[PDB]
Symmetry: D2
Subunit: 166 residues, 4 copies
Amino acid sequence: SFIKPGRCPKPAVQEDFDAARYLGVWYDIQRLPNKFQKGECATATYSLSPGVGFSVFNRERLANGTIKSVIGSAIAEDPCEPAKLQFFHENAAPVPYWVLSTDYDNYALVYSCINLGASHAAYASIVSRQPTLPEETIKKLQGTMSSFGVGVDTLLTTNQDAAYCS
Amino acid sequence: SFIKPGRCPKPAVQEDFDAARYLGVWYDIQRLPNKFQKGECATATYSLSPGVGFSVFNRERLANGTIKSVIGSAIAEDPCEPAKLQFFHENAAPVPYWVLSTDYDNYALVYSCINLGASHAAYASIVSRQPTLPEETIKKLQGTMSSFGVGVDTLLTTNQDAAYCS
Amino acid sequence: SFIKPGRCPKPAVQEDFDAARYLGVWYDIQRLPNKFQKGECATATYSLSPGVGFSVFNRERLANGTIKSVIGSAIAEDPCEPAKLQFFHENAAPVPYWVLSTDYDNYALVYSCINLGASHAAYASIVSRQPTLPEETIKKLQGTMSSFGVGVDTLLTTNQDAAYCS
Amino acid sequence: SFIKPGRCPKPAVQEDFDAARYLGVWYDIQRLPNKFQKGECATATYSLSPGVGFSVFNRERLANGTIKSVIGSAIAEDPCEPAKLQFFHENAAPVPYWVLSTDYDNYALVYSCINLGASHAAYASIVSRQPTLPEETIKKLQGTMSSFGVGVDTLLTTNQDAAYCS
Ligand SMILES: C=CC1=C(C)/C(=C/c2[nH]c(/C=C3N=C(/C=C4\NC(=O)C(C)=C4C=C)C(C)=C\3CCC(=O)O)c(CCC(=O)O)c2C)NC1=O
Ligand SMILES: C=CC1=C(C)/C(=C/c2[nH]c(/C=C3N=C(/C=C4\NC(=O)C(C)=C4C=C)C(C)=C\3CCC(=O)O)c(CCC(=O)O)c2C)NC1=O
Ligand SMILES: C=CC1=C(C)/C(=C/c2[nH]c(/C=C3N=C(/C=C4\NC(=O)C(C)=C4C=C)C(C)=C\3CCC(=O)O)c(CCC(=O)O)c2C)NC1=O
Ligand SMILES: C=CC1=C(C)/C(=C/c2[nH]c(/C=C3N=C(/C=C4\NC(=O)C(C)=C4C=C)C(C)=C\3CCC(=O)O)c(CCC(=O)O)c2C)NC1=O
Ligand SMILES: *[C@@H]1O[C@H](CO)[C@@H](O)[C@H](O)[C@H]1NC(C)=O
Ligand SMILES: *[C@@H]1O[C@H](CO)[C@@H](O)[C@H](O)[C@H]1NC(C)=O
Ligand SMILES: *[C@@H]1O[C@H](CO)[C@@H](O)[C@H](O)[C@H]1NC(C)=O
Ligand SMILES: *[C@@H]1O[C@H](CO)[C@@H](O)[C@H](O)[C@H]1NC(C)=O
């Protein structure tokens, strides 16, 4: 999704990550530019799976008012690295999805990277259990992002205004 | 997981494979020796996924009457190759799973292979919608297995006796 | 390293591809935009490998006259699909490299693709044993490139002018 | 190519591994049972690659005195992990090859593991720059292997007798 030079960094993930506590609704707060989000008001809904991992339901509002959504399935392929997921969205090739940091109740810092020779395509995201996230939490997560080569300057803020998104 | 010489054959899969028709209950009729089937009366149940692919519930009876079962998730990582799945069983590393041939309402030939240098570990299985499958059908699928270098003689026949399996 | 929408296409590869005839010097005639070519006069030289596959030496001229180069190794990881190689350059992650069409003594259409969810990163190339290639030959390879969704308008022409590259 | 239960362990590899100091001739001293060594007197010879990584030439003596050898190519696909190699032996699928420990001048502990569902296939070997290695060094390396579940009882000692190998 977003090309930067160098090979993919390998940042720390959430230690002892617990997926059952990660389920539910997360709101997109900030994110690296990508090719899949085409609007605003983005939310992810993660739910229990009857097999392994969990189901994914992403949803956003387009500027012309059209609502768009996708379904996918998330799986930790190595049970010993539960924070290192892979998402299989409908009609999409698999993408990595690592949870760098989360407190389950408020925020989460998500990272994703795929190698491209001497370059890489990266995606990063700050999400929240609410349409807003406190300013301090955001600055902290931006802080870790800098350590693995994401520029805070390059981030897009997602519109989560209550009126516009209903 | 059966070690044989040579690299994994790359047999053909079922053309224009339709997972919705592959769902439901399958009985293990014959199978390559493996490390996971520990008894008899083996069935697989495939169900809808709210994400992609489908949910898996494999189940067998032990000699002492104890029922053993596992849950997992099946996903075709390349949507243009829907018959070439990957199974993510709980407590297992991901494994390949090809539907080489199926008519959906009667039989299916499942193959799975993993390379080990100049050797490979293979798993193959004939399943049926009924606890039995006609011998001529069994013979035909055995033909297919031989055509890509599996020995029919090494196949194990699975117990599906209504008396024993009830 | 060029983003286009959709998953990677799988165009046909060169039949009975013979790497021994593909060795030697190729001149870049035109190619998709990428992050590795920074100048002109780009050439690829393919050489004997004492193990498997063959050796790679890429070379171009910078605008200030500085020559830049990389070495790498090409390996056909599956001997039965010899046209589907993996290229391992110094300081780079592995990249696919398919020889889609070549007559060995004149031209070659090179392709490479890596998936990015519902998008993909592509690189495509028309190379030649001479610094120029006939207009009729280029158009044919353009017909093929068009067939998997690269537009001739998106292509860059490589400077192979004898004076300037000298 | 030796099947054990559980997923592949992830042992530490030699820190700051230098492939350049690893070149030349190593003798097989002890090894896990595998499918490729058919005799004795086995040596691996590693040499410069004109591309990336290094060149591979393995050879052993068969019981009937006939000598057999293979060539391949070794590559660290992740340059930041030079001890984590991939070996491409001729006509074989790629295999992992980790250097867990080496002092370059005397010994080396090589490990390799490929997952097979809830089981795995492993290969490990203690090599030496001489046909023999001191018992204390061997014991030390056997110690390391034990910590990740290879049985010292399962190890085979390789015949490197000077006369028999002459
Ligand atoms: C997404 C896929 C992808 C591919 C395929 C790819 C090829 C590739 N070409 C490279 C160097 C190079 N490659 C070329 C040119 C060629 N390269 C060719 O495959 C051919 C046919 C030519 C034509 C001669 C040149 C000239 C260099 C060196 C340029 C320089 O470093 O200044 C490198 C080394 C890394 C770098 O210098 O940044 C890679 C990885 N990179 C990718 O990200
Ligand atoms: C390079 C890596 C990479 C990733 C990680 C990735 C995720 C991804 N997000 C998607 C949809 C979506 N994704 C989101 C939003 C999110 N998505 C998230 O992973 C998170 C955390 C949010 C935050 C809420 C939304 C709203 C959609 C639906 C978009 C639409 O239909 O327009 C899709 C589906 C494909 C599509 O319809 O275009 C993919 C593959 N794609 C990639 O190429
Ligand atoms: C599951 C992982 C796995 C590994 C790692 C592996 C290594 C491996 N060793 C091979 C040959 C060989 N390998 C060796 C010896 C060695 N090989 C070594 O990795 C080392 C350290 C030595 C020590 C000297 C020899 C002597 C041969 C040649 C066998 C012959 O031709 O008789 C081959 C070629 C296949 C063949 O033709 O038989 C492979 C794939 N195979 C696997 O399945
Ligand atoms: C290298 C290849 C390879 C494959 C394919 C594989 C499948 C596989 N089958 C499993 C359980 C199982 N698998 C089955 C039966 C089936 N399974 C089928 O794919 C089909 C068609 C049936 C027939 C109905 C059953 C009944 C179980 C549960 C067994 C138990 O509880 O012990 C498991 C779970 C973990 C384990 O017990 O090892 C795996 C990984 N394992 C491998 O190593
Ligand atoms: C907005 O855009 C989408 C895709 O471009 C389109 O399908 C949809 O109909 C548009 N909504 C309108 C015009 O209401
Ligand atoms: C049946 O078998 C398994 C092991 O084979 C054992 O764990 C289980 O307790 C047994 N149950 C009995 C004795 O019914
Ligand atoms: C050529 O230009 C590149 C641009 O970065 C630079 O790396 C290099 O120093 C230049 N060579 C010179 C100054 O001769
Ligand atoms: C020795 O035995 C091997 C098989 O065991 C055989 O292939 C080889 O040719 C034999 N060597 C000779 C010439 O006796």
